[PDB]
Each structure stands twice: as structure tokens, then as C-alpha cells.
Amino acid sequence: DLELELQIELLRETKRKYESVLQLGRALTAHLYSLLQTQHALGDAFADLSQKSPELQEEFGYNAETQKLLCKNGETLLGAVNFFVSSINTLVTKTMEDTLMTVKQYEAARLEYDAYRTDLEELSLGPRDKYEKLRGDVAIKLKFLEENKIKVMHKQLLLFHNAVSAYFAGNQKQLEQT
């Protein structure tokens, strides 16, 4: 049957891309985390130099505050990015699997009906029904997840974007509070 296996083949290409996204996701997390460690250390290094270098007190001064504010805001952003990737993960590691698994059960009793047909076909003219039950839990299971995809990606994609945006706004704001 075409319907399902056109619906499945797409549920994989999609499980894939969302993985390729999930990759770039932890990466973003990674690089972001590091960058924060650096800005934290850099703000302390600048605060210190500010106290010791009266000739360059202001210059080291505004540089430390900035880096400190940036680090603080970066924390929230990181939280967000994590919640993102995390949730996108739940939608791939579990919810999607739960569906991709019942497909395996469907595939188990799938080509065995299409095989046993052509197979026990030779044997004829010479001189066992719950195959669809899985079909229910794979069509009703399948696009019952698509709604779920939409519901999650919509929300997740919005939080993420808002988070990134908020990042720069929160930064640009307090950054002008000097």
C-alpha cells in the first residue's frame, strides 16, 4: 500500500533533517557555552585590570561591565537554546520513535503478506487477519504525530527565535544604560 509508505518515507526524511538540525543544535549549545566561559573570565580579567591600572581604568571598566552583562544575558539564551534542542529531541528520540516503532511492527507483518501471496502462488492448480490492526496503529498512529510535530515545532521555533531576538534587545538596552 502506497499511502502509508509515502507517509513513512517522509516521516524518516523528516526524522533525519530534524536530526541534522538537532546536530547543529548541540553544536550551537557547545560553542555558546564556551563563549560564555570566555566572556566571564574576560570580564573578571578586565575588572581586575581596571582596579590596578588607573591609567586605563575606564577603558578596562566599561569593557568588564559589558562582558559581564553579555555573560548574564547569554545564560538565558543558553537556557532557551537548550530547551529548544531538548524539546526537539523529545519529538525525535521518543514521540517520533513510538511511531517509527509501530511501523517496524507494521513492516514485520508487511511484506510477509505480499510475499506469501506470490510465494504460495506457484503452489496452486496442477494435475491471520490483524495485519491491518497494525495498519490502524500506523495510520492513526502516523498522522496523529504530524499534528504533534506542528504543535511542537511551531512553539519551539517561536521561543527559539524570540529568545535569540530578546538576546540582542536585552543586550542593546542595558548596553545603553551607561
Partner: protein, 177 residues
């Protein structure tokens, strides 16, 4: 001391595996670890404590704009090419030699032969001929270095580590001369 070494070269050559194998002693073929990550290392270059800063890159044209962004303040380029890829080897003069020089014309360059194992194997050896092509030899790679101005020319396998540990010792020596 701080030495910055950038690894450049046609994608698929093994620049990423070259650096993960070296710095972590493991092949990344397992999940392909953190994208666009850079790596550093602490090696003893003759009773000398060195902090090696290794920069990975992306050979695809898509990144031709933000790639040279890592070249400033560099100390030694390692133009790579696959010994199993004659095509990649051509771009050694077609793309890399120029670009690296286009920005920093005065920095030592080390030509490396990534994948020295798939040079005598039963598979690519056949499909290599299948395309009317053959693997890169010592010459024309040894001459390629000279055709450019490389301070050295080594070969190695990120999957066997043979010649790996060396490639960087040469990168460093090429620096402090």
C-alpha cells in the same frame, strides 16, 4: 608558546578526522562529533612546552566568505589533499595555494597526504581506474610541495595514526624554525 595552525583543503580529505585522531586518539566516524569545532594541543617539541591551536575549516564553496576569517594571525598552514583523490590534489594549486597566500603571503605551508592507507587497497584502487584515474604518488606531491614553496611534505593516515603525530611536530618546528 602559542602557535596557530590552520588546516585547509578540499572537503572529504579528512581535515576534521586528522585533528580529532591527533588530539583525541579516536576516529570521529562515530556520530561525527561537534560540528565546526576547533582543537588545541599541548606537545613537547624538544624539551619545549607548546600550546598548539588547530583550526579546522570547510572546503565547500559555501564558506569561501567566512573561511579566510580564520587566517589572520596564523603561523602555519597545512594544505591537505586526499592521496586517493587526484581531483582534490589538483585543487591544491587550483584553489588552496592561492587563497592562503592571497591573505598571508609569508606564512610557512605544509602539504599533507591525508589517507595514506586507501592507497593500496582492493576497492577504490579499482573504481579509481573505473574513472580513468589513479592515486597520488610520492612525486607530484613532493613536486607539488616544491611547485608551491612548502617548508615540508609529509603523508599520514588519520585512521592508522602512522605519520600523524609527526605532521604537527613539523608544523611547529617550521614555526620556531
Amino acid at each position: 608558546q602559542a602557535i596557530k595552525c590552520v588546516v585547509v583543503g578540499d572537503g572529504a580529505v579528512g581535515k576534521t578526522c586528522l585533528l580529532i585522531s591527533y588530539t583525541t586518539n579516536a576516529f570521529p566516524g562515530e556520530y561525527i562529533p561537534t560540528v565546526f569545532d576547533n582543537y588545541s594541543a599541548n606537545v613537547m617539541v624538544d624539551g619545549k612546552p607548546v600550546n598548539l591551536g588547530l583550526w579546522d575549516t570547510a572546503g565547500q564553496e559555501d564558506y569561501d566568505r567566512l573561511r579566510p576569517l580564520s587566517y589572520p594571525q596564523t603561523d602555519v598552514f597545512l594544505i591537505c589533499f586526499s592521496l586517493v583523490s587526484p581531483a582534490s590534489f589538483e585543487n591544491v594549486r587550483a584553489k588552496w595555494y592561492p587563497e592562503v597566500r592571497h591573505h598571508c603571503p609569508n606564512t610557512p605551508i605544509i602539504l599533507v597526504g591525508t589517507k595514506l592507507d586507501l592507497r593500496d587497497d582492493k576497492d577504490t584502487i579499482e573504481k579509481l581506474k573505473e574513472k580513468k584515474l589513479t592515486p597520488i604518488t610520492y612525486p607530484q606531491g613532493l613536486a607539488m610541495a616544491k611547485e608551491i614553496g612548502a617548508v615540508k611534505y609529509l603523508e599520514c593516515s588519520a585512521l592508522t595514526q602512522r605519520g600523524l603525530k609527526t605532521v604537527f611536530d613539523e608544523a611547529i618546528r617550521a614555526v620556531l624554525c
